[PDB]
RNA sequence: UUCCAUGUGAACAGCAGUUGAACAUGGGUCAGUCGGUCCUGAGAGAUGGGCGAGCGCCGUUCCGAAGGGACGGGCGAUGGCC
RNA sequence: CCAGUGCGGUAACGCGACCGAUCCCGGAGAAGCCGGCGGGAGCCCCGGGGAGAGUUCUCUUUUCUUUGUGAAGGGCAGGGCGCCCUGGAAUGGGUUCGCCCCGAGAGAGGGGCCCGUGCCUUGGAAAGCGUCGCGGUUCCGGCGGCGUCCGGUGAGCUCUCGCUGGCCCUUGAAAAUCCGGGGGAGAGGGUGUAAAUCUCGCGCCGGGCCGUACCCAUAUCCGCAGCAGGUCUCCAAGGUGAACAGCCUCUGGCAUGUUGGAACAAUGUAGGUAAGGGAAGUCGGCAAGCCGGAUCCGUAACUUCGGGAUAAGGAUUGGCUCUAAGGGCUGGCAGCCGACUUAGAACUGGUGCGGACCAGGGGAAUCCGACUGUUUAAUUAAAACAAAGCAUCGCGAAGGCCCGCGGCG
C-alpha cells in the first residue's frame, strides 16, 4: 500500500494544512490540498437559521471573480435577507404607518370633538 | 423498567460526592435540562442556551431568566410589584 | 521573609483578568438630551453570555438621534427580558421591566438594577446575577433619594441616575453545588488566576505569616488591624466580632 | 492458507468458545444487531403501508 | 480546455487570430480536432469519417495544421 | 533550518568560504611562519555562534 | 555544506578498513500560483502628557488644534485634432 | 410624435451582462469538546478475465505482481435544506440507531436552491504503466505490435462531507480582505453610424524581493562524543485477534548497534526447572509464584442505594461432519443473489483444547486520607498539598485588598 507524503513544508495536521487524496494519470495517489468549505450568506433578520439560498457558497475573497447575479437573487433586499422576512417586513411596514394614519384621524377628531 | 430507586438524573455521579449534595444536585439538574414551554407559541421547547439564556427552539427567540428554571420566583414576585406600581403611578 | 501571595495579586502580571473571550463592558447609554427630557426606543436584538460573568447581557440597538446611524450596546439583562423586546429608556420611559429610567420618577418599592452611582457614570450598583435594588424613600427638594443596596445596606443617591427595572437575569445561581474541582476550575479559569487557594499555615514562615512550625497551627491571633503593613495584613482584617453569627 | 481458513469459518469452523476472545458486544453488538434489525421491520412495514397491505392505523 | 459541439463554432473559433495551431487526432471511433487558442484548447470531437475529412479540407490554409500519432 | 534568513545565510555563506585550508604557494614566501589554517572548524565539534 | 561526484589513506571513525557525515579538489538549492512578505492575537511600543538629579521611566487613549483624504462645483495654467 | 437604466416564473428562484456616489444595514472572514448515524472516496476483501513470473517427485482451471486518469470547465448520479405551491390532518398521523415534526400547516403530489472532492466528457492517449520484439554496435522523452477489462461486498481501517443530540456557575479569538442589500445625489441620447454604462464572452501586457540542497535521530539536533537520554508532526498493508495488544509476514530498510576468534571454571547479570513439606526464611510473603480471555451460571456483609462486583465459587473451551435461525432484488408464491454470525447435535483425539502470545490472585478486619488531581527534576508519591462542602472577616468606589522611587500612576 503505496504510504504518501506531504507536498509542502507545514508538515502539521492544522486548518489549513487539510488534503484529499487523488489518482493521477500515472496511477499514483498524490495529495491536493483543497480549499475550504464556504458558507452561503445568512439573512439580516437574526431569526431565521437557514443560509439564504440562490447564493454560491464561496470562500469569501472568491466572490471578487463571480458575477452580480450568482452573488444576489432577483429581489428586493434579495442577496442578504430571507423571503419570508422580507414579506414579513413588507406586511408590518404597511400596516404600522395604516394604525399611524388611525391614530392621526382619531386625534382630529379629539380635538373636534374639543 | 425503572432503573434506580431514589438517583434520577444524578446516578451519573456514582457514589461521589455524598448524599445531600448529590440530592441537593438532582433538583436543580432536572429543572435546567428539562424543555420547558414557550409563552410566545406555546411550543415545549425552552432551552437552557447558557447560564441564565433561555432560548426557544421553534420561535428563534432568547429570553434572559434564571440559571436553572425558566423563571424565578423573585422574578415573578418583582413583575407584578412593578405592574402595580405601574397602575398605581399612572391611575 | 518573602513576598506573599496577597502582596503578589497587585502587580498584575499572571493575576489580570482572562479578558479576551469577554463580549465588552456592560454600561447604560450615555446622557443626552433625548434621555434627559424624553425617551428614546430600542430594541433587543439578542442576548449574549459574558464569559466570567453569571449574568447575561443583552445587545439592545437604539437609533442614533442626531445623524442616520443605529448604535448598538450591551446592558445588564433584567430577569424576564427576551428579543424583540423595544426597551424604552428615559425620564418619561415608563415603569415596566426592561426599562431604564431615573431613580427621582419611579414611586416608592420598586425593584431596579444595573444601578448608577453617581449621576452619569452609566451604571454601577447592584448588576451581579440575579440581584437587585430597591427604591426607601426621596426628598424632592435637594433630589436625593434613599436606596438600600443588596448588601442590605442603604445610600443616599442623586435622584437623576439611572437604573434598569427588574432583578438581574440569571438569578439563583449559587445554590447549585458547584460539585467538582473541575467545576470550580472552569468558572475560576474564565474568571482569573485565584482558585487553588493554599491555606497559609501550609506554607513555610518565610512566604506567609502563618506558616512553619510542626503543627499547623496559626500561632498569632488571626484577628489583625488595618495598620497592619502589606504582607501582615493577613486572615481576617479587623474583625468587629469574630466567630459563628448566631442571632442577627 | 488465509482464504482456505476463511471458508472454514463460513462453513462454522474455528468460532468456538476456545477460538474466542472478546465480549459478544465487541465482536458483533448489539446496537448493530438491533439497528439492523429495525431497518428491516420499518421497510417492511413501509412495504406493507404502501402496497396498500395494511392501512394508515394499524401500520402506526 | 473547452469541447465545441457544432461545426460552425469550430470554424469561427479556428478563424480567429489567436489560433496558433489546430491537430488532428486520428483514433478509432473517432476524430478530435484540437485548436490551440491564446486561453484553452478547444476540442471539436467527430465521429463521421467522410465530413471529418471533408472538414480537415475545410481548415482555413494559413494555419498549421499538423496530424498526430 | 531550511527556512534561513538572508542575514544567516550570508553569514553562514562566509564562514564557509573562510573554511577554505592554505594554498600551498604560501609557504615558500620568505618571511613566513605559517604552517596551516590554524582557524579551520568542523562542522561536528565547533557549533559557529548564531 | 554535513548534500553529490573523482581521488587519497598521514591524523579521526575507542579493532580494521579498499569504507565514511574524515581529508583534498570540483559541482549543487531556478517559483505570480509553495512559504515569508499583508492582518490582527496574548502582548510589545514611540508621539501628546505626566514623572524624574539623570541615562530615561510610567503610560497606549488618558491632561492632544491627533485628517494632508474625497464626490461635486467655481477659479488659473498645461499638454494633446486646445 | 411618444417610450426605451433587460427579461422569465404564482413562489422559492432563474437567465450571459443587466447604470449609479457620500451615507447606512448585514453576510462571509469567524469558530469549543464529545456521542450516534448516513453519503463520498483512498486502502483492504471476494468472484472472474488478460500479461509476466513462482511450484510441479504427486496434487493444485494453482500462487504472486500489475490491471490508469490531474487542475479548470460542461453534464449527471449522489447527499442536504429551519425553501416554495395545492390542500387540510383525530380513529391522530409521519419518522429516527436515539430523537423528533405538525393547524405557526403533518402526511400526499409537484417544484426550487446548496454542496456535487464521485461517474461520463473536454484535458486524454499523443503521454504513463505492464508485456513481447525490432532498430542507433553509439549519441535516442527511438520505434513498433498487443493490453490497460467485467462484477460483488462490508458494525471493515484512514480521510472528508452532512444531519442530529449531549456537556458547561467552561459558551469556546481577533483584524486585514471581500461581497450583497436599502437608498437615489447624479449621468446618459432624442430616435441613431444612438449614448452613458456593463460583475457576460473573448483578446493584449506584467507579477519584483527573500527561503528552497541535505539530516531529522539508537551517526548531520542538544546532552564535551557517532552518548541506550531528550526533541513538535504527517502516511500506516496481510494473518490471528475485540484491537493502532502481542507474535509471524509483504512493499521498504538493515547488518545486531565503538571489535573478532577459542573455550563453557569459579563469582556474577538475565531467563528458567525442581521431588517432599508449604512462609518453618526474613523486620515484613521482599523477589518469585498462583490467578488471568470468552461463554453459560452464581454472587455475601456493608452502603451515601449509585455501588460493592470480574465479589467469592463452579462448569464449558480443540479438530471435524452437520442442522436450525437471523437479509436484499425482480416479477403470504416463485426466481436470483450476497454476507457475517449465534444456538444446538453427532463423531473424534494418550482428558488435550483462551494449547504460543494476550491475560485481575482471593477473603475477613484495623488506622489515616473521602474521591478524581498535585507533590520535593536527581534519596521522601505519602497520611502532605489541593478540592467541592461549611463558617468567618473587610469593602457601596474619594471604597476593601495590593503594586509602585515617582505621577490626574
Ligand atoms: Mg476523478
Ligand atoms: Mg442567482
Ligand atoms: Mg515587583
Ligand atoms: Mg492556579
Ligand atoms: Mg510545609
Ligand atoms: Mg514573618
Ligand atoms: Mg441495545
Ligand atoms: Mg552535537
Ligand atoms: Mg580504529
Ligand atoms: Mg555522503
Ligand atoms: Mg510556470
Ligand atoms: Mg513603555
Ligand atoms: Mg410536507
Ligand atoms: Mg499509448
Ligand atoms: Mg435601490
Ligand atoms: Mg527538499
Ligand atoms: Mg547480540
Ligand atoms: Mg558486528
Ligand atoms: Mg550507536
Ligand atoms: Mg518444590
Ligand atoms: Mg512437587
Ligand atoms: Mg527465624
Ligand atoms: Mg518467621
Ligand atoms: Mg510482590
Ligand atoms: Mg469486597
Ligand atoms: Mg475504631
Ligand atoms: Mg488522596
Ligand atoms: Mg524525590
Ligand atoms: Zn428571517
Ligand atoms: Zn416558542
Redesign the pocket.
Known amino acids: 500500500?503505496?504510504?504518501?507524503?506531504?507536498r509542502?513544508?507545514?508538515?502539521?495536521?492544522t486548518?489549513?494544512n487539510?488534503?484529499?487524496?487523488?489518482?493521477?494519470?500515472?496511477?499514483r495517489?498524490?495529495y491536493?490540498?483543497?480549499?475550504?468549505?464556504?458558507?452561503?450568506?445568512?439573512?439580516?433578520c437574526?431569526?431565521?437559521?437557514?443560509?439564504?439560498?440562490?447564493?454560491?457558497?464561496?470562500?469569501?475573497?472568491?466572490?471578487?471573480?463571480?458575477?452580480?447575479?450568482?452573488?444576489?437573487?432577483?429581489?428586493?433586499?434579495?442577496?442578504?435577507?430571507?423571503?419570508?422576512c422580507?414579506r414579513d417586513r413588507i406586511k408590518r411596514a404597511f400596516l404600522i404607518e395604516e394604525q399611524k394614519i388611525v391614530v392621526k384621524v382619531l386625534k382630529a377628531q379629539a380635538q373636534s370633538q374639543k | 423498567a425503572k432503573?434506580?430507586?431514589?438517583?434520577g438524573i444524578v446516578?451519573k455521579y456514582?457514589?461521589?460526592?455524598?448524599?445531600s449534595?448529590?440530592?441537593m444536585v438532582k433538583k436543580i439538574?432536572i429543572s435546567?435540562?428539562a424543555?420547558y414551554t414557550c409563552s410566545?407559541?406555546?411550543?415545549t421547547?425552552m432551552?437552557?442556551?447558557?447560564?441564565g439564556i433561555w432560548h426557544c427552539?421553534?420561535?428563534?427567540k432568547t429570553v434572559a431568566g434564571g440559571?436553572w428554571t425558566y423563571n424565578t420566583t423573585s422574578a415573578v414576585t418583582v413583575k407584578s410589584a412593578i405592574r402595580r406600581l405601574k397602575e398605581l403611578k399612572d391611575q | 521573609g518573602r513576598?506573599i501571595r496577597?502582596?503578589?495579586?497587585?502587580?498584575?502580571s499572571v493575576f489580570?483578568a482572562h479578558?479576551?473571550?469577554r463580549?465588552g463592558a456592560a454600561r447604560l447609554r450615555a446622557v443626552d438630551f433625548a434621555e434627559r427630557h424624553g425617551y428614546i426606543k430600542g430594541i433587543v436584538?439578542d442576548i449574549?453570555?459574558d464569559?466570567?460573568?453569571?449574568a447575561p447581557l443583552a445587545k439592545v440597538?437604539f437609533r442614533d438621534p442626531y445623524?442616520?446611524?443605529?448604535?448598538?450596546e450591551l446592558f445588564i439583562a433584567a430577569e424576564g427580558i427576551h428579543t424583540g423586546q423595544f426597551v424604552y429608556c428615559g425620564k418619561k420611559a415608563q415603569l415596566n421591566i426592561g426599562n431604564v429610567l431615573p431613580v427621582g420618577t419611579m414611586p416608592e418599592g420598586t425593584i431596579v438594577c444595573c444601578l448608577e452611582?453617581?449621576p452619569g457614570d452609566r451604571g454601577?450598583?447592584?448588576?451581579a446575577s440575579g440581584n437587585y435594588?430597591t427604591v426607601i424613600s426621596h426628598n424632592p427638594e435637594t433630589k436625593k433619594t434613599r436606596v438600600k443596596?443588596?448588601?442590605?445596606?442603604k445610600?443616599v443617591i442623586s435622584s437623576a441616575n439611572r437604573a434598569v427595572v427588574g432583578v438581574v437575569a440569571g438569578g439563583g445561581?449559587?445554590?447549585?453545588?458547584?460539585?467538582?474541582?473541575?467545576?470550580?476550575y472552569?468558572?475560576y479559569?474564565?474568571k482569573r488566576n485565584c482558585?487553588?487557594?493554599?491555606?497559609g499555615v501550609?506554607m513555610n514562615p518565610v512566604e506567609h505569616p502563618f506558616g512553619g512550625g510542626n503543627h499547623?497551627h496559626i500561632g498569632k491571633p488571626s484577628?489583625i488591624r488595618?495598620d497592619?503593613?502589606?504582607?501582615?495584613?493577613?486572615g481576617?482584617?479587623?474583625?468587629?466580632?469574630?466567630?459563628?453569627?448566631?442571632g442577627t | 492458507?488465509?482464504?482456505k481458513?476463511?471458508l472454514?469459518?463460513?462453513?462454522?469452523?474455528?468460532?468456538?468458545?476456545?477460538?474466542?476472545?472478546?465480549?459478544?458486544?465487541?465482536?458483533?453488538?448489539e446496537?448493530?444487531?438491533?439497528?439492523?434489525?429495525?431497518?428491516?421491520?420499518?421497510?417492511?412495514?413501509?412495504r406493507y403501508?404502501e402496497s396498500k397491505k395494511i392501512?394508515?392505523?394499524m401500520?402506526? | 480546455?473547452?469541447?465545441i459541439e457544432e461545426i460552425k463554432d469550430f470554424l469561427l473559433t479556428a478563424r480567429?487570430?489567436?489560433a496558433k495551431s489546430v491537430?488532428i487526432?486520428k483514433?478509432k471511433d473517432?476524430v478530435?480536432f484540437?485548436v490551440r487558442?491564446?486561453?484553452?484548447?478547444?476540442?471539436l470531437?467527430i465521429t463521421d469519417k467522410e465530413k471529418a475529412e471533408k472538414l480537415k479540407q475545410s481548415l482555413p490554409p494559413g494555419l498549421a495544421v499538423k496530424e498526430?500519432? | 533550518?531550511?527556512?534561513?534568513?538572508?542575514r544567516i545565510?550570508?553569514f553562514?555563506?562566509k564562514?564557509?568560504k573562510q573554511?577554505?585550508?592554505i594554498?600551498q604557494w604560501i609557504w615558500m614566501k620568505t618571511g613566513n611562519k605559517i604552517r596551516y589554517?590554524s582557524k579551520?572548524?568542523?562542522?561536528?565539534?565547533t557549533?559557529?555562534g548564531l
Open positions: 500500500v503505496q504510504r504518501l507524503t506531504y509542502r513544508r507545514l508538515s502539521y495536521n486548518a489549513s487539510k488534503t484529499r487524496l487523488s489518482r493521477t494519470p500515472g496511477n495517489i498524490v491536493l490540498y483543497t480549499k475550504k468549505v464556504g458558507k452561503a450568506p445568512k439573512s439580516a437574526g431569526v431565521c437559521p437557514g443560509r439564504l439560498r440562490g447564493v454560491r457558497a464561496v470562500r469569501p475573497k472568491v466572490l471578487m471573480r463571480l458575477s452580480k447575479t450568482k452573488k444576489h437573487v432577483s429581489r428586493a433586499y434579495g442577496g442578504s435577507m430571507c423571503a419570508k422580507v | 432503573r434506580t430507586k431514589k438517583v446516578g456514582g457514589t461521589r460526592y455524598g448524599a449534595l448529590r440530592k439538574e435546567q435540562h424543555k410566545f407559541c406555546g411550543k421547547k432551552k437552557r442556551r447558557a447560564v427552539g421553534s420561535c428563534m440559571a | 513576598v496577597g502582596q503578589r495579586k497587585g502587580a498584575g489580570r479578558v479576551k473571550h463580549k436584538k449574549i453570555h464569559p466570567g460573568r453569571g440597538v445623524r442616520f446611524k443605529k448604535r448598538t452611582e453617581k454601577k450598583l447592584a448588576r435594588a443596596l443588596p448588601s442590605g445596606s445610600k445561581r449559587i445554590d447549585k453545588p458547584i460539585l467538582k474541582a473541575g467545576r470550580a472552569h468558572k479559569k474564565a482558585w487553588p487557594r493554599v491555606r501550609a499547623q484577628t488595618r497592619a503593613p502589606a504582607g501582615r495584613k493577613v481576617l482584617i479587623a474583625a468587629r466580632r469574630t466567630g459563628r453569627l448566631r | 492458507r488465509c482464504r481458513n476463511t472454514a469459518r463460513r462453513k462454522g469452523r474455528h468460532m468456538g468458545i476456545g477460538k474466542r476472545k472478546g465480549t459478544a458486544n465487541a465482536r458483533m453488538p446496537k448493530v444487531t438491533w439497528m439492523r434489525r429495525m431497518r428491516i421491520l420499518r421497510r417492511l412495514l413501509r403501508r392501512d394508515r392505523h401500520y402506526h | 480546455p473547452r469541447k480567429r487570430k489567436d491537430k487526432k483514433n473517432n478530435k484540437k487558442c491564446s486561453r484553452y484548447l478547444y476540442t470531437v498526430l500519432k | 533550518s531550511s527556512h534561513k534568513t538572508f545565510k550570508r553562514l555563506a564562514k564557509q573554511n577554505r585550508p594554498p589554517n579551520r572548524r568542523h562542522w561536528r565539534r557549533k559557529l
